[PDB]
Amino acid sequence: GWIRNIGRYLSYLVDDTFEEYAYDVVDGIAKARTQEELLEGVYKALRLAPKLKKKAESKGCPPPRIPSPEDIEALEEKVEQLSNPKDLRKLAVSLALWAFASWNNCP
Amino acid sequence: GGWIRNIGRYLSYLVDDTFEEYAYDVVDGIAKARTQEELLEGVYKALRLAPKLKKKAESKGCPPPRIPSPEDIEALEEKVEQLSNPKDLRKLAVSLALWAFASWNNCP
Amino acid sequence: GWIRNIGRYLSYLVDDTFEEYAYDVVDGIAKARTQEELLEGVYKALRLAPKLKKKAESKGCPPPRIPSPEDIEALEEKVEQLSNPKDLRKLAVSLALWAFASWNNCP
Amino acid sequence: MYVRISGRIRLNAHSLNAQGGGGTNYIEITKTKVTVRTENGWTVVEVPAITGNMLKHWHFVGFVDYFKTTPYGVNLTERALRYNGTRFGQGETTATKANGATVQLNDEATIIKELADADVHGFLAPKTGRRRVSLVKASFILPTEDFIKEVEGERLITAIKHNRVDVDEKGAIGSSKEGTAQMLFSREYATGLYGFSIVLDLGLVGIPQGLPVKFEENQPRPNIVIDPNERKARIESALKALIPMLSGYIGANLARSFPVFKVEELVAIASEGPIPALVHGFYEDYIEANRSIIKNARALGFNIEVFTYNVDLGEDIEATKVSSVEELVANLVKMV
Amino acid sequence: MYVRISGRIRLNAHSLNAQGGGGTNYIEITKTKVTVRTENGWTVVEVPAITGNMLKHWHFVGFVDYFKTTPYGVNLTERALRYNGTRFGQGETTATKANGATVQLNDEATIIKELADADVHGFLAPKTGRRRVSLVKASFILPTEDFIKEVEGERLITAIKHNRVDVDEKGAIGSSKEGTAQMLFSREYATGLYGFSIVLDLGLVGIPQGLPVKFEENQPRPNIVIDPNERKARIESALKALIPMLSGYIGANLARSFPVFKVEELVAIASEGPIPALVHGFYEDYIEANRSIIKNARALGFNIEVFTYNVDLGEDIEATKVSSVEELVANLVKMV
DNA sequence: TAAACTGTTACAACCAGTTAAGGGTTGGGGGAAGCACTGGGTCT
RNA sequence: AUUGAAAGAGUGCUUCCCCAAACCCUUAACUGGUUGUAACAGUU
């Protein structure tokens, strides 16, 4: 549902071509054992977003798509509602799992 | 529907020979996971150990290790989230662990 | 069908030439009232399979080979529709029986 | 004599009783299914568990440890000093003696007099067929149901890798072709509010099961084939064996786990006659049930003594609030 | 002699006992589930910790370091010199000795008498099947319960990156075709008010498990195989091996990390006879529980001495005040 | 008496190297595996 | 109400008891997010 868009952008960080890798942020947002470092890594990805946009519009690829704001606030409401570490860890891992998938971004 | 073959391919590439990188800790984590969170961490770690496989395949001339399709991840998320029963969750995790060991078309 | 190869590659655990004698795995596979535990047993068999291959190549006997993927596909597509426990027990006992047979391991 | 103990103990970071999953390196802790309602019916969930066989072994260890100090500790199995609970294994028609000799199996009374291990923890000799049910009953150390309610799972288990690093004489790690021993075995460590309960029927020590009573004049009289001092020493040693069972000594892989193993709450009852067994700490709420059981047993005419720790046990139930398990065993041995 | 030393330490930026990357640069450290109340039920939370295998191996390291200086350290395994944790890991036949001789895996008592490395930490010779339970049952390293309760967050783990920069003979960082050696990795560093509880059963070190006693004339003495002087030296060295543990010589990444340590509250019990083990430092009432168990054991009667590091503990206790750890073990070994 | 114009949002290398993923040891011992109760013929 | 009327394979039995998947086992080790770059130019 609301994991495709943000997961798509997460896979935009590391994929075919795109000669700039950032796995520390993915690892941080995956194993978010505490309430935070999750939004921290997501914000770090959003900060590299202009870098990805420039690289795409320059080298070989169509411009990347930023996750929709409704998706971001849906994620924020989901992480606010959960209290136990189980749901938080499950959400974090499901969020960061899409970063490694076969996406045909650059033709 | 579709996730079976691709998950088997990727997990075999992670576990099969001609790689000298035999990661069974991820397979054990995927297998022995009563709750869904640790199964998700195991499959995430397996997917994360993609660049090593790609680099090794490029270095030794092996065919590139195919990455599971996004629709496969979709189906994984749906069946993990929609099945709160630990029984079916354990069944799916052990099925993935079984598909971790398969003699597919390896390097020629 | 697809019973010959799985039985051959499962009988290596209890075979005499391998001095580990994983009787427990075959015991768990044999009398399994539910699919998940027999699946766990065959997973343990596949997990011990690299050890059997290593000891076979160290001794000199031909190494065992991983079961063919089509065998796993058949097992997965047959295990889903085990609505009645009787067929599940039949499959588990058949696998256990084919885990106890003579094979040409060390010529 | 007969003493039943139960309670709730909080455990963490323990790989106690790990099966290993066969010959594989992934050592997994014992897990057993339990029923927890979770307000949606008594669903079955797999939870880490501790076998009562391990409790029997550790009670054996404590018993031999506290019988070593006793002046009459000579009458023990050779394997008792070995910390080996194997009594009359395969093809054993004799008993190993700590003095350096052998004991012939002729009567259960002789076995229990010469060997206190078969007397307390029982024995089984296939060659002779002699049987003796143990006076120590051990239950599985299971997490509290209310604990499962308040944690809703979370797998209760952490997986830790334990790479065994080996360096050759030259100084090379090796690739298994130089005889080196490098290895990755993974272990599972659990936690939670486990529940414990042990029954100790110290009424047959020195009394063979073949004829526990002689009925000299149609009266009840235990057939104590040993001297009363030896029986009292056995009582004291077996009762003091509970101290390591509750302080720090329990489970397997104690050399590398050694959990906190503190007593959150404890109840125990002692009497000279048969008494109902205590309820386990697995259940979400058993304090009221224990209070009712104790008050009804006292009203029935049972002269039982109850010792509690961190449990109020109501008001009209009389019980000395002990401060630790050692005080509990002191009260258990104070009346001789 | 049996000595049990528990207490609390403070850790800051430690990567001790990592789980390992397993191919990933994010080096996992060991985590454990722990139960806390937080006034809403004792839920389980994942917290950084290190296994008792860490403490056991570092006790072995201190063991070999102290035998490197004692005059009776000649009888040591050549593997033990290089801090090699393996003790008969592979199914070998003749074990190499640092002196220049070899050890055959027969007559376990002879190995106990001659070899000193496998006397307190045990051995599991797999070919001959000769096993020996160790006598250092090291515990885990977990924080304070009220600490986690009052923080309700603030993950005790931080991720810090590092890089191995390449410079070559031409002064460049090789990308793919002139040397792909430049490498980065993310390491996890932890903090917190951790606790430990090291139990040390030195009372039967040098005593083979097969025949701990002989009882030739019903006498209470162990079956010693070595001269008392060497045994006492081994006991002293093993107990002094705990000195580097409580100063910052434990854990993994000891070179790069070197965790910071402190002495805040330590309770130590020491006696020749069997005594209950204390509680691993995890809770708030551990001091009260230790005081209760000590007073109750004294009521039972034990030649047990207690050493306290500036802790309130309580009254009517003859425990002796201590100021550091090396002087503590010196006071422990003050009698021979 | 006026209220920042603007180029710029890090590049680049790299994203675990290796070594082993149980070693060993044992795979039910040992007793018994219905105890009577109910008899069907052929003769006197 | 019938080759059917009356009709106990039934009555007691702890597959039992004893038994630590147990024991030894630092993803360990080495490895800097490193290096260069004026918030700068100019302003009544």
Side-chain angles (χ1 to χ4, degrees), chain E residues 114-144 146-250:
Chain E
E114 186 260 353
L115 190 50
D117 183 26
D119 280 328
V120 65
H121 280 249
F123 63 94
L124 190 151
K127 218 55 190 164
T128 49
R130 305 190 173 275
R131 72 187 268 283
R132 189 179 189 276
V133 65
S134 167
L135 294 174
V136 179
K137 292 99 177 182
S139 59
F140 261 68
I141 296 295
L142 277 296
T144 300
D146 180 69
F147 182 76
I148 289 175
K149 282 196 290 290
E150 66 95 12
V151 298
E152 66 264 11
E154 287 87 4
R155 201 172 102 250
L156 282 68
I157 315 159
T158 179
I160 297 169
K161 296 176 73 68
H162 312 267
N163 51 351
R164 180 163 20 98
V165 176
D166 275 343
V167 304
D168 63 358
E169 70 272 347
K170 300 303 179 180
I173 316 184
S175 308
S176 166
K177 44 180 184 301
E178 66 269 16
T180 314
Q182 192 274 330
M183 187 66 204
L184 65 92
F185 70 96
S186 310
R187 190 65 176 264
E188 281 179 317
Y189 299 106
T191 182
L193 183 63
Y194 292 126
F196 64 92
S197 71
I198 295 295
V199 62
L200 300 166
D201 303 330
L202 277 296
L204 73 165
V205 164
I207 313 293
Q209 299 283 344
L211 271 183
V213 300
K214 306 160 304 312
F215 291 164
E216 74 261 18
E217 197 46 277
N218 305 323
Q219 73 287 336
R221 66 179 178 88
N223 180 27
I224 193 66
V225 296
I226 61 186
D227 46 357
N229 186 208
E230 206 271 348
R231 179 188 179 273
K232 185 60 181 180
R234 184 173 310 165
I235 301 299
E236 290 175 1
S237 51
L239 183 62
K240 287 189 302 178
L242 213 50
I243 297 169
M245 321 275 268
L246 282 73
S247 68
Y249 262 95
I250 63 164

Side-chain angles (χ1 to χ4, degrees), chain D residues 183-251:
Chain D
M183 172 95 77
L184 177 60
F185 68 98
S186 308
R187 199 99 182 204
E188 309 215 319
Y189 300 84
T191 180
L193 271 171
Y194 287 92
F196 80 102
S197 60
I198 305 106
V199 160
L200 304 173
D201 291 331
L202 279 82
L204 280 74
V205 294
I207 297 89
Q209 300 182 182
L211 196 56
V213 291
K214 288 293 185 180
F215 275 116
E216 277 87 4
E217 208 69 28
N218 309 336
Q219 95 289 338
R221 195 188 70 88
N223 187 29
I224 309 166
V225 303
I226 61 187
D227 61 89
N229 189 23
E230 157 65 33
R231 184 173 181 268
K232 171 60 191 58
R234 199 167 307 180
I235 297 293
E236 185 176 359
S237 49
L239 264 183
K240 287 181 175 178
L242 203 44
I243 307 176
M245 301 275 318
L246 271 298
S247 64
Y249 278 42
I250 197 180

Side-chain angles (χ1 to χ4, degrees), chain E residues 251-274:
Chain E
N253 215 21
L254 183 63
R256 272 160 304 282
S257 65
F258 206 105
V260 303
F261 268 35
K262 198 44 183 44
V263 180
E264 284 90 346
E265 54 259 19
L266 275 295
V267 298
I269 75 176
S271 88
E272 303 282 341

